Amino acid sequence: MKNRLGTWWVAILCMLLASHLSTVKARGIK
Secondary structure, three states, X not given: OOXXXXXXXXXXXXXXXXXXXXXXOOOOOO
């Protein structure tokens, strides 16, 4: 209800993508 929210979620989208754009990286085959 607009109080604590804000970026808390923004972090999620930055967290769920993190790995995706971190360890998920693999330009060397596989």
